[PDB]
Symmetry: C2
Subunit: 331 residues, 2 copies
């Protein structure tokens, strides 16, 4: 009965100088304070984001896992590490470097710390190669961003990558990143509060409404971060539009809501009513506990929202433990 958190991030101890060998402007690296308790993710010379020790230090993280009653945590790249805009070969080198750093992180206690890998998604062949290599090396799966510029998950290159993983039994976490919105949502974390749930919804609907699930083998294990964004709540409007508009039916042979048996979501929706609706839509077998640790907006008491919810007790057990153990093949 291990309590599993499957949505969490790490960032490796990369020096400015090493990041500079990749991109002096765009490669992230880590600056650590004096006391050693805090630091910032950097981009060239700019502060990109303040972080704390649990992000880069597995010893310290274990102690906090202990304090949260978290038995096993799955952790993956902070999305700033993706490098989807870089020249392909440099990005494939970078992913291999990041993925080895992840394995060194997990090696502190690989019974309790599991890792997912990143891939150079801008090149299908290198991405498939890196996925297979990383999983054979000990990663339990891959974390990708939800889009690659104007390419959403329905794009042939992304569908091909998903198919590869399906065929190789490689589970996928899809994480929103590089949020839409441009110039109008630049205050009060609006891109996190508005653009990010829209991104995740869009990625899910791109697979559904393009008929991608009719081409991708049922073996695909794929989870969408952050509760699937606004997907659960907006699904009625999607089923309605599908029934009453031809251009919505065009490539999708079944009502959209039926495809929920093809994917998973995490539980990070920050409200009992919201989580109940999510479980109602997805089914108790397809929601996994994830906290977004160790980021500020990560769940303060991991699993607390699930245990406070009105859900059945077996549904609670599945969300806290059972569903992830199965999804990521943890024993």
């Amino acid at each position: 009965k291990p309590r599993i958190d499957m949505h969490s991030h790490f960032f490796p101890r990369i020096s400015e100088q090493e990041a500079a060998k990749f991109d002096a402007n765009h490669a992230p690296w880590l600056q650590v304070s004096a006391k050693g308790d805090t630091g910032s993710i950097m981009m060239g010379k700019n502060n990109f984001r303040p972080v704390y020790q649990a992000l880069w230090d597995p010893a310290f993280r274990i102690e906090e896992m202990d304090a949260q009653g978290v038995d096993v945590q799955v952790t993956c790249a902070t999305p700033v590490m993706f490098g989807y805009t870089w020249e392909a070969n440099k990005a494939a080198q970078w992913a291999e470097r990041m993925n080895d750093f992840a394995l060194e992180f997990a090696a502190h206690n690989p019974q309790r710390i599991k890792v997912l890998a990143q891939v150079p998604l801008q090149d299908l062949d290198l991405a498939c190669k890196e996925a297979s290599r990383a999983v054979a090396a000990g990663h339990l799966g891959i974390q990708i961003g939800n889009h690659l510029g104007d390419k959403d998950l329905d794009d042939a290159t992304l569908e091909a990558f998903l198919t590869h993983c399906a065929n190789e039994d490689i589970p996928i976490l899809v994480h929103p990143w590089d949020m839409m919105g441009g110039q109008r949502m630049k205050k009060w974390m609006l891109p996190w509060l508005v653009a990010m749930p829209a991104e995740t919804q869009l990625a899910i609907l791109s697979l559904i409404l393009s008929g991608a699930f009719e081409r991708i083998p049922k073996s695909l294990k794929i989870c969408f971060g952050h509760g699937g964004g606004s997907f659960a709540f907006l699904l009625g409007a999607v089923d309605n539009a599908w029934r009453h508009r031809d251009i919505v039916r065009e490539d999708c042979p079944r009502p959209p809501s039926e495809y929920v048996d093809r994917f998973f979501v995490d539980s990070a929706v920050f409200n009992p009513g919201a989580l109940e609706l999510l479980v109602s839509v997805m089914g108790e077998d397809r929601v996994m506990l994830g906290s977004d640790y160790p980021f500020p907006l990560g769940e303060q008491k991991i699993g607390g929202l699930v245990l406070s919810s009105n859900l059945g007790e077996s549904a609670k057990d599945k969300i806290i433990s059972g569903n992830a153990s199965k999804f990521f093949n943890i024993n």
Copy 2:
């Protein structure tokens, strides 16, 4: 009991020739085919969008309106006619006719057909005095968009505008418009399933997190179309961000969920669980029945969702009749 429907749309019988007096190109007009049972919308030459002989030919509505237990139906501009892009005075000039053509469509039965006015929201005064003039002529309120044609949607410009309306007792229906993700969402009405609900959430949150409802008189009557988009589902995540991030609190002195008392939404969420969560969040006093009739994606059983739900009798009543009656002051 009555059965009000505060969300429905119309488009007047403007000619190719007469519409060209504003803009033969960017200013829309109604092509009925020839006979009675069909017609299309032209921007001038091109076919903008097909449409339905019930959007106009009023009393036919009464058939539908009576065919579906409806009694009083508020109705307003199909968003094509906003012209927020344009030269101010000619859109000012343009809103006039549409608003005049509005009552002309309401003229048939000013008791069972109420209308709201469009304004040139791109110039305050023009929109102000037009909002003013239009109501005096019988309009029940004002429908605006969240955008301003191609805008970032916040300022004391519109703060002053909402204030203006709050003082002169002018209700507002906000309607999502000209959506956000541009080069993506090219298919399957993705802009309607994804961009528009995010847009409406963005409008609302922009008011809350700007600390606008603090300076706007509580007298403001404002309703958000389509259930407030994804607002209700995503609110927990918004409250969590406000509680744990300073920048989210910079201008909003209360948790955002505390501001639900300053606004209204319709019930058009096409799902019972979605509806139940909507009501749990906003309160029975602040959700109203609406349909987006006669549009294809409009509710097919006007009020049937609300009616076949398991909410309280007071709830069903305040939603189908009570709140519509008070918001728009209707007997």
